[PDB]
Design a protein around this ligand. Structure first.
Ligand SMILES: CCCCCCCCCCC(=O)OC[C@H](COP(=O)(O)OC[C@H](O)COP(=O)(O)OC[C@@H](COC(=O)CC)OC(=O)CCC)OC(=O)CCC
Ligand SMILES: CCCCCCCCCCC(=O)OC[C@H](COP(=O)(O)OC[C@H](O)COP(=O)(O)OC[C@@H](COC(=O)CC)OC(=O)CCC)OC(=O)CCC
Ligand code: HEM
Ligand code: HEM
Ligand code: HEM
Ligand SMILES: CCCCCCCCCCCCCCC(=O)O[C@H](COC(=O)CCCCCCCCCCCC)COP(=O)(O)O
Ligand SMILES: CCCCCCCCCCCCCCCCCC(=O)O[C@H](COC(=O)CCCCCC)COP(=O)(O)OCCN
Ligand SMILES: CCCCCCCCCCCCCCCCCC(=O)O[C@H](COC(=O)CCCCCC)COP(=O)(O)OCCN
Ligand SMILES: CCCCCCCCCCCO[C@@H]1O[C@H](CO)[C@@H](O[C@H]2O[C@H](CO)[C@@H](O)[C@H](O)[C@H]2O)[C@H](O)[C@H]1O
Lengths: 431, 55, 352, 125, 352, 125, 55
């Protein structure tokens, strides 16, 4: 992970990789679902889909280019992939699609079909993707009536009320130069991509700043979507976590790594050095779980998600997990922190250094849009190696011990007890 | 499982006084039973202590 | 004992020990599956538990994957700990314990799960069928263990003996210093392994055409076609799969999936049509076969197939490249077909 | 007391020609006076099983030996309730009084101790 | 509206109502099974419970068998109570309640049971497979309901209307006086039934040859062959079946079962080889085919098959009788084949 | 009291113009005073269910109405626990207070009655 | 199910005194428990009756 960034109005950032074999060029905006309203919610997912439209994709396919678009909470990306030399043609397609096709892609035939696609797409997700649907409701109840609560794909209600005018108004306010970063990852060199950008000119949609509003706030609450027809109980629970640029960003991630992820069906997963495993395998409290330390611009979420068929012992699953979390404040051991350090590094490694250029493009853009430059692993590893048991305890003492929680769940959740019973387990009795 | 559920004695306490599923809407009239339990205990305790000085 | 690697200045490395022991080499249905599920269990000197606990402290994980061709023992870790992971993978191939209780407590349950997940997806059933009718005992072997043919612990140990040999494997390092990797491999038990005989056949396998098999199934119905491809005729089938899947073909929105499985002695082009209702699967595959009979391509999907095929960064043993710079047309001769699901209302080969 | 500990002590004595000839004759007499063989039981049948180790060991025991262990136990309980011993020719013989379950118990224990050591590994920086 | 009867001075009689609505006529997979399973449930004026308790006090029982051709409502009872049973069966055809709860509480579970029993017998999976491959939707429909194609309560009622019509059924009596039978039948709700058509086809069904299907299965392996037969050619196949299932053939001990399913527009000859291990199955099926391809008969089993065909005195309208005195030689031409079980180790039609 | 009995008496009154003009008004008054509609419940939701006839009926009730019943019940317990009533626009209206379960109850009752009669039939030879 | 197993009160009597699975080989030494129960009842009953005449 090595960065290089320059500017001339349009901020350009790249990251060379001599052993790439391909290259990805694109634009990333510092506005995602958290920059939408409860009524135009889904407008970004809508943009993503028209950019990947059938027509637009053919025009790129003939050019030997592959398209990619990712909608998140804080950022939004549109990336083009090609061979290392065809990079000059990728920028032409980008310039063509976002500085000329302001009405090409927004035709009544293309739009109504795309709208129809994302509509069925989202209907399916809400209908069958239980673990992600639950996790989305977790964000929805935790940050309710606040920016961070809106689902990245949007709601079926506001999705079907959208018109080309909604797409345009969003573009006019967010697809601006001051809210973007041109990204180039793969094998291409920095002092070469900027030239092709300087080769052209104009300034259509510039000078203007994006809009502002209220900041994300965590609220202790819950949303229960009971469905007895499903074969499992899917739940997600979390406390208010850390925002990107928080002093405890790495400490929180190390804490999540301590409890990690688990798949009851994979032999090696059952053997991990996570004390919680000794409590949940006796009666097989779940099929799987995974801890997380989600971080965004305004706030974060630290917690876990689980899936279980043991619908009569959900109280034990929750009880044991939260009881292990208490340990982070009062008894986490040195070895537990050292095992977490090793594995956090490993995960940060697989994330920041995959052989995939589109992954690096999204990470580069989204990061420079906040801190001004992507963080190197070498520095990340140094901060991770410096984390002490005390750091973890001090952190747990403020974000975990006797703190409000956000819960969401669907399926056979009758066995999931009331809020207070769950909230109580966030601390222990003592003299 | 939790010790309160696995222990032979605690599981009884757990089923009757802790995890016992109550209708969400029972009003104060349903508090009379616990009150009768208190009465019995009050009556027995005071009676025994008086019994020590009675003929 | 081929040992390749490609260095870089990163924090993470990847170690892989490719073994030509995929389902294609399975002596009994599912033994290759069981052997794959047996990797990383107890070794005569280090237990599965110790391996996981120690490797976690170091900063790495292990995994064993099953292909129709290989059994890959990969390991991801922190660059400077290479020897440990080279020795770890070595011990697996050399001194795996194969305790009877591990077969019943871990291996079989894991294989049951693999089969359970796979059985719910009809395209995977369709794919097993395609292979089984086009080829009939090598490449046509079932990919997973299903118990129709009982496999003993002994059979697993025998297949281990037949498959884990110096001549039948490649040590691929990714983001690793090749000089050191070659040194550690020789110093490890990898080189102490009994030199065997590479099971890889140079000659093209026998194949069949115009074959059909129907499988009744509750759920989504699927109509699929499979076509055996020559070693030299595979470059065109590769761009065909990318064409049929890209925005360059009007019938791409009519097909769920289409790919070309590449082996050193040939390949199999697979095209699947999956949908909730049979009426739709019928009209689609019907329109697909009809339109393919009209030999067309022109090759506007040549620079696209080049880009798509270039996304093989992790693969350190990819087939022939230069072939793409040619062939512009594709016809459609004889092929193999399978119907999964609402069979009673799916097309037969006769009417396609 | 663990079987690992028992085996350590017994092996030391067994490997020592001095203790071996002084201790074994005592143990042979102890076993014969114990009388479990007169009820048709092998010593390994006597091991209290209501603990984790024994359960994993008993689960791992091959079917054929498990069916036989089952029979020896039922046969023993029946004989005991009638207040008799088995007919002479049905007594377990010294050569039949084999430690069939010991290897399984030792395997389970070694695995359990390792897990205990690994659950408490200390790390030296 | 056919009505026949053969009397005798017995104590017991047996009424039968042959309806041409077996699996061959099923508009949806298993719909014939479900209707057959719905018979004897509540009628609009008499409950299943009332029917059973009442008939028990009289001394009679009911039953509804499903065939590949028929759905037969049959009654066995004390002779003198004839009109009661004539009406009971009449009421079933004319006014079965078809309550939603009966479908979920009694019918679906019973069909689930029927399927469960048959699913464990591989020769039945083969018999279904045979019919399917030689008559692609005619009599080739699945015999039982398996849920691959959903059948609603309405689909069952629709099928009841399509099949329960006067011109589509044959009333039959045994140990019954034909005079009273016809009288009671006309006097019953049978005559009030709408007289629809009669899907009983005269023209020979479209058949297929050289077709094969393979199904993986846990348990015994079974290799079977099917042969479509003419409305005239079915005489030699009747003796063929008996010849192969008698001491006259030096290969009767090599085959599990062999028979000739007869219909008015033709028939299907089926032969099955079933055994625990695939190797035994393979040897037999090969030896059977080779010896039949090198055809031989000469009718030494004409008198035998004449006896066996006669020990079937229940069909008051069975096929051609005296057709035995004709043809005597036989040679195995083209046929259809299915492999059930250890498929990866069973013969392909290719090597037969 | 069985619903068959209730219906028999009720139908009789409902068919009689004289009784119907006299009773129904009083009954309408009774139901409004009862107040269950203010809690969002339909009368059929009030029937004690802990008996075989009701379990049979509730089993047979179509999926969609069953989910609807569950909601009205849950919503009612919540409203009642807060000591409030639902806003008027959520009250069940007379048009909505339909005997949706009644037909299933009468059907179940008739079947049990027949089964009871058949279990105790006498025979006349 | 038999009434002795279904009834709330008798099911306790049944599991402890009726269907309780006892090891086939327990000898007379295992008869002391019941004898201790008898002792407690003898003490309580004789004691209550004497208590009626005690000062
Ligand atoms: C001589 C020997 C006497 C010994 C007996 C002593 C114990 C008496 C028990 C009283 C009882 O059972 O009455 C129950 C009724 C039913 O009531 P409900 O429908 O369930 O309540 C709704 C609450 O306001 C919810 O409200 P809440 O939020 O729970 O607080 C309720 C209230 C409870 O007060 C009590 O102590 C209950 C009697 O607290 C207050 O606001 C009072 C502040 C001064 O409560 C009443 O209506 C009381 C009148 C009879
Ligand atoms: C002391 C003051 C207060 C206590 C008063 C109550 C005394 C009861 C306590 C005694 C006790 O528990 O003794 C237990 C021993 C063990 O015995 P075991 O190995 O299980 O029996 C095998 C049976 O003979 C089988 O034989 P059986 O068919 O059950 O008949 C047994 C015998 C039982 O006699 C008794 O009353 C039981 C003690 O009846 C007879 O034939 C002999 C009648 C005198 O019984 C003995 O024989 C004692 C040996 C030292
Ligand atoms: C359900 C429990 C009990 C009830 C309802 C009860 C009721 C009574 C009543 C009404 C009286 C007379 C009160 C008076 O006017 O002075 C009384 C007296 C007495 N009770 Fe109880 N009693 C109970 C339990 C006990 C117990 C367990 C004991 C014995 C240990 C006991 C010992 C006495 C004594 C010593 C008196 C005489 C002193 C006095 O007058 O209070 N009582 N009891
Ligand atoms: C009033 C006092 C007691 C009563 C009524 C009582 C009753 C019983 C009963 C009914 C049994 C089962 C049958 C039997 O084994 O005899 C039993 C078992 C047992 N009791 Fe007690 N008991 C009493 C006191 C004690 C004491 C003082 C001890 C020990 C300090 C004790 C230890 C045991 C043990 C360990 C068992 C299980 C024996 C076995 O199954 O091997 N009991 N008792
Ligand atoms: C269940 C265990 C009991 C035991 C072990 C027990 C034991 C004794 C003993 C050792 C004595 C002295 C006997 C003597 O030498 O005279 C005694 C006396 C007495 N006990 Fe108990 N007792 C028990 C229960 C009861 C109960 C429930 C009562 C009820 C009030 C009671 C009432 C008396 C009375 C009134 C006396 C004095 C008269 C006498 O000497 O017998 N006892 N008890
Ligand atoms: C026979 C029946 C007689 C009495 C029936 C009444 C039932 C109520 C018993 C009260 C026990 C309360 C324990 C709470 C607990 O353990 O939660 C503990 C918290 O306990 C407390 O905060 C202590 C508050 C003071 C309790 C008041 C004592 C009551 C006075 C006794 C009078 C009764 C005779 C769990 O707390 P946490 O969930 O927030 O982590
Ligand atoms: C009128 C009485 C009606 C009878 C109902 C009885 C209900 C009892 C209600 C009160 C429960 C409170 C005490 C329970 C103690 C819990 C701790 C425990 O059981 O630890 C026990 C050990 O306890 C002892 O040694 C002494 C218990 C004496 C109890 C004195 C009252 C641990 O037992 P454990 O469940 O862990 O056994 C595991 C399997 N080897
Ligand atoms: C310190 C106490 C320790 C634990 C106490 C429990 C020990 C139980 C010992 C008692 C044995 C006597 C049981 C007799 C009751 C059996 C009949 C029964 O329960 O019929 C009951 C009705 O009982 C009554 O009305 C009176 C209760 C009797 C009170 C006795 C003092 C019928 O109840 P049923 O089980 O049939 O319910 C289903 C039918 N719809
Ligand atoms: C039978 C009659 C006898 C009555 C005796 C009265 C008992 C009083 C017990 C009082 C306090 O007991 C005390 O309760 C508080 C919760 O309220 C516990 O607090 C615990 O939960 C609270 C949250 O609610 C956390 O903030 C706290 O960090 C945690 O320790 C504390 O650790 C315990 O020590």
């Amino acid at each position: 992970a090595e960065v290089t960034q320059l500017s001339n109005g349009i901020v350009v950032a790249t990251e060379h990789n001599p052993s790439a074999h391909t290259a990805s060029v694109g634009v990333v905006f510092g506005s995602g679902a958290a920059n939408e309203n409860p009524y135009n919610n889904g407008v970004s997912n809508l943009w993503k889909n028209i950019f990947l439209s059938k027509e637009n994709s053919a025009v790129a396919a003939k050019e030997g280019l592959a398209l990619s678009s990712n909608i998140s909470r804080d950022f939004q990306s549109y990336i083009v992939s090609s061979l290392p030399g065809s990079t000059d043609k990728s920028l032409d397609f980008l310039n063509q699609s976002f500085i000329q096709q302001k009405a090409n892609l927004l035709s009544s035939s293309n739009f109504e079909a795309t709208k129809k696609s994302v509509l069925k797409q989202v209907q399916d997700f809400e209908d069958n993707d239980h673990p992600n649907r639950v996790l989305e409701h977790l964000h929805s109840t935790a940050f309710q009536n606040t920016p961070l609560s809106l689902p990245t794909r949007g709601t079926l209600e506001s999705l079907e009320n959208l018109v080309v005018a909604d797409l345009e108004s969003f573009a006019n306010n967010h697809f601006l130069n001051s809210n973007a970063v041109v990204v180039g990852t793969g094998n291409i060199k920095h002092e070469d991509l900027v030239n092709s950008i300087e080769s052209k000119n104009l300034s259509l949609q510039t000078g203007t700043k994006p809009v502002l509003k209220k900041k994300a706030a965590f609220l202790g609450s819950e949303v229960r979507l009971r469905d007895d027809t499903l074969p499992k109980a899917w739940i997600s629970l979390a406390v208010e976590g850390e925002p990107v640029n928080s002093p405890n960003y790495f400490v929180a991630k190390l804490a999540a790594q301590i409890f990690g992820s688990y798949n009851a069906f994979e032999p090696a997963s059952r053997l991990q050095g996570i004390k919680l495993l000794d409590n949940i395998q006796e009666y097989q409290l779940c099929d799987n779980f995974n801890h997380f330390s989600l971080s965004y611009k305004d706030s974060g979420l630290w917690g876990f998600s689980t899936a279980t068929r043991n619908v009569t012992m959900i109280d034990d699953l929750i009880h044991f997990t939260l009881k292990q979390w208490n340990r982070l404040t009062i008894s986490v051991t040195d070895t537990e922190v050292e095992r977490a350090k090793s594995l956090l590094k490993l995960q940060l490694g697989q994330l920041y250094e995959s052989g995939n250029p589109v992954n690096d493009a999204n990470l580069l853009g989204a990061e420079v849009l906040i801190k001004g430059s992507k963080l190197s692993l070498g520095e990340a590893f140094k901060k991770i190696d410096a984390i002490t048991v005390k750091d973890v305890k001090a952190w747990a003492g403020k974000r975990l011990w006797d703190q409000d929680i956000a819960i969401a769940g669907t399926g056979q959740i009758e066995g999931l007890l009331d809020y207070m019973r769950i909230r109580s387990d966030m601390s222990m009795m003592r003299w | 499982m939790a010790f309160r559920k696995s222990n032979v004695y605690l599981s009884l306490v757990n089923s009757y006084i802790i995890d016992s599923p109550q209708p969400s809407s029972i009003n104060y009239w349903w508090n009379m039973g616990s009150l009768l339990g208190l009465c019995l205990v009050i009556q027995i305790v005071t009676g025994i202590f008086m019994a020590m000085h009675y003929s | 004992l081929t040992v390749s690697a490609r260095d870089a200045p990163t924090k993470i490395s990847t170690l892989a020990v490719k073994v030509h022991g995929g389902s294609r080499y399975a002596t009994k249905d599912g033994v290759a599956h069981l052997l794959n599920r047996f990797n990383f269990q107890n070794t005569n000197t280090r237990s599965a538990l110790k391996l996981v606990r120690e490797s976690e402290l170091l900063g790495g994980t292990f995994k064993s994957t099953l292909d129709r061709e290989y059994i890959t023992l990969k390991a991801t870790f922190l660059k400077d700990d290479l020897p440990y992971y080279v020795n770890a993978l070595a011990d697996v191939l050399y001194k795996t314990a194969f305790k009877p209780h591990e077969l019943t407590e871990s291996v079989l349950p894991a294989a049951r799960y693999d089969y359970a997940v796979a059985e719910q997806c009809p395209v995977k059933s369709a794919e097993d069928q395609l292979y089984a009718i086009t080829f009939r005992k090598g490449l046509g072997n079932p990919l997973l263990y299903d118990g129709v043919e009982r496999v003993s612990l002994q059979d697993i140990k025998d297949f281990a003996d037949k498959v884990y040999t110096k001549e039948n494997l490649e040590v691929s390092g990714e983001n690793v210093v090749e000089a050191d990797l070659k040194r550690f491999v020789d110093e490890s038990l990898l080189s102490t392994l009994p030199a065997g005989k590479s099971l890889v056949s140079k000659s093209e396998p026998k194949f069949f055409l115009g074959e059909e098999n129907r499988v009744r199934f509750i759920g989504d119905s699927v109509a699929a076609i499979g076509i055996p491809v020559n070693k030299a005729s595979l470059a065109q089938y590769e761009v065909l799969a990318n064409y049929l899947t890209s925005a360059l073909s009007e019938l791409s929105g009519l097909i769920s999936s289409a790919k070309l499985d590449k082996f050193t002695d040939g390949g199999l082009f697979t095209l699947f049509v999956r949908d909730q209702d049979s009426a739709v699967v019928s009209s689609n595959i019907k329109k697909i076969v009809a339109d393919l009979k009209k030999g067309k391509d022109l090759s506007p999907a040549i620079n696209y197939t080049k880009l798509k095929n270039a996304v093989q960064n992790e693969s350190v043993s990819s087939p022939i490249e230069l072939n793409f710079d040619a062939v512009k047309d594709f016809k459609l001769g004889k092929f193999n077909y399978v119907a999964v699901g609402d069979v009673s209302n799916l097309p037969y080969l006769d009417e396609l | 007391q663990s079987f690992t500990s028992i085996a350590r002590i017994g092996d030391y004595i067994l490997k020592s020609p001095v203790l071996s000839k002084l201790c074994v004759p005592v143990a042979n007499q102890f076993i014969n006076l114990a009388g479990y063989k007169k009820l048709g039981l092998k010593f390994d049948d006597l091991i209290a099983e209501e603990n984790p180790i024994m359960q994993t060991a008993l689960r791992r025991l091959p079917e054929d030996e498990s069916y036989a262990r089952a029979y020896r136990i039922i046969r023993a309980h029946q004989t005991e309730l009638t207040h008799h011993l088995l007919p002479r020719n049905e007594w377990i013989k010294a050569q039949e009084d084999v430690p069939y379950l010991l290897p399984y118990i030792l395997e389970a224990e070694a695995a359990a101790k390792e897990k205990d050591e690994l659950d408490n590994i200390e790390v030296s920086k």
